Design a protein around this ligand. Structure first.
Ligand SMILES: C=C(C)CCOP(=O)(O)OP(=O)(O)O
Ligand SMILES: C=C(C)CCOP(=O)(O)OP(=O)(O)O
Ligand SMILES: C=C(C)CCOP(=O)(O)OP(=O)(O)O
Ligand SMILES: C=C(C)CCOP(=O)(O)OP(=O)(O)O
Ligand SMILES: [Mg+2]
Ligand SMILES: [Mg+2]
Ligand SMILES: [Mg+2]
Ligand SMILES: [Mg+2]
Lengths: 288, 301
């Protein structure tokens, strides 16, 4: 019965959770937090009050960091923002569970934005829609890469993947703000802006290496230049090169000279770097 | 072509949908006792939700539950789930995590298909949000104790709080969504919390008893019997046996004989197996000594 009492008390109450518990399981998240402007700027138009703007800000921050914690496990990444990734320190189990926990903490914050039911429902749909989009994008990035060469994407498939994957959070942010604003949409603009951002991330991962980690190569990522290279070689009948690009991706190698060979193939043999640099310029042009 | 791309919603073919769904379909094809699904139909005898809402609640629960197991198997380095290879060993940890997470959000999406009524809708989202937060808290504690061992040896009380969060979470999510949708005029949450607790201690018990592959040992999990053995040896200054329990859990061993040795210690030295069997019977007695529901539990004794 002394036991009966405690059980009775246990089951008749909300689950017990302390501030110490909160701290112990937030470790992976506090670590990446150790490593926006766009929102402040975009507000000039949206015109959201400050405390509301700060909530949008906390929300995208939780979602952005959480998704990187997961992405780094997915991409076997050793470094993020110059430091060791959380999963290498705290382990994959803790990191995944904490990142997932923060997605739900983020969701909780949405209700602090409003109570107006029409509005709230729309804010939730936005949150739910773009998170679904991010996972669809991520899922293809990962599938193409881990099942290569089962599927060789075309430039169009890559752009659609990116629209899902990178576009998700850019669209989530803008859409939360548009819907909260007293008042055409900026979604197509944010879309092009995310496509650019992603292709540039892809490009810079290789070019900063060619001039002075090229980790995407160790990941085996179907980046924008790799996708161009793989379709170019197939289209020009460069069988040997097409296969060698496939083989180096599949090695998941950290060897610097092997990574450099691939980058120089993209440089001189397929011209993918130039093509990618140009492509970025043209998209940036569509705004100029 | 750019214009048309950025002025449309992102593309998603049913073919893509099918690619991403594989890790999930993989676990879906290996059944279970459908325990939660069955519990739902029963309880609806008293909740009386219209059949369509009952289908949606069941689906949300099925998605949450199966995805949660896909992820738990990654967190637990599990080679088998429901007598079949785990999804992360086939499609890899990366796709498996992403797909499980994707399904959490597809379960969320189904919540707005439950109701138009914006007042009711707010509460359903809150229920969904709160129990997913609770599920992750219990799971984070279970993982923390295991991966930081021997930094913190949980007490029986801490274990029970961890279980109320971890296993009680989806049981409470199920019941609360239904009490909230019920057109019918106390609550079953306390009952569903006890069930959850029984259910988890029994899982921990069965993983060691059916052996005595006792994967919980390989995992190094702070299961109920193990929590009992460590707190016991600890209480009676049994330094050496306590340390040995700790050494075997820390080996993360797949050794049949070493696993056997630890089971032997819990059986013959701390007597944790019988302690757990008796603890489960007492929790069942609280219920059965307080109707389809009445059977269900007895079934768990
Ligand atoms: C914001 C999200 C979820 C996309 C991250 O994908 P990537 O793997 O392409 O991004 P990086 O690791 O290069 O930052
Ligand atoms: C959104 C993508 C593609 C990955 C993260 O990019 P960022 O370079 O913006 O990541 P942080 O600056 O926050 O490290
Ligand atoms: C103890 C928990 C919560 C995980 C296993 O649940 P089940 O044992 O009900 O799994 P399935 O029957 O669906 O395989
Ligand atoms: C899957 C969730 C959310 C709780 C059960 O985790 P456990 O690791 O204790 O369950 P089993 O693997 O024994 O099924
Ligand atoms: Mg990455
Ligand atoms: Mg990635
Ligand atoms: Mg497990
Ligand atoms: Mg587990």
């Amino acid at each position: 019965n002394k036991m009966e009492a405690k059980i009775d008390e246990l089951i008749n109450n909300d689950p017990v959770w302390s501030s110490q518990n909160e701290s112990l399981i937030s470790k992976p998240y506090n670590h990446i937090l150790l490593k926006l402007n766009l929102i402040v700027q975009i507000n000039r138009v949206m015109n959201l009050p400050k405390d509301q703007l700060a909530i949008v800000s906390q929300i995208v921050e939780l979602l952005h960091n959480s998704s990187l914690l997961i992405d780094d496990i997915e991409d076997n990444a050793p470094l993020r923002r110059g430091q060791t990734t959380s999963h290498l320190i705290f382990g994959v189990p803790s990191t995944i569970n904490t990142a997932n926990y923060m997605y739900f903490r983020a969701m909780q914050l949405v209700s602090q934005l409003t109570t107006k039911e029409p509005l709230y429902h729309n804010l939730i749909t936005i949150f739910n829609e773009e998170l679904i989009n991010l996972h669809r994008g991520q899922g293809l990035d990962i599938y193409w890469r881990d099942f290569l060469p089962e599927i060789i994407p075309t430039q169009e498939m890559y752009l659609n993947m990116v629209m899902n994957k990178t576009g998700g959070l850019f669209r989530l942010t803008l859409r939360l703000m548009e819907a909260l604003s007293p008042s055409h949409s900026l979604v197509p603009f944010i879309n092009l802006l995310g496509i650019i951002y992603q292709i540039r991330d892809d490009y810079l991962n290789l070019k900063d290496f060619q001039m002075s980690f090229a980790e995407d190569i160790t990941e085996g990522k179907l980046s924008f230049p790799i996708v161009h290279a793989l379709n170019f070689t197939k289209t020009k009948g460069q069988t040997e090169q097409h296969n060698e690009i496939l083989r180096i991706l599949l090695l998941r190698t950290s060897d610097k000279d092997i990574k450099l060979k691939l980058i120089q193939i993209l440089e001189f043999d397929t011209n993918s770097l130039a093509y990618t640099k140009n492509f970025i310029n043209q998209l940036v042009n569509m705004i100029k």
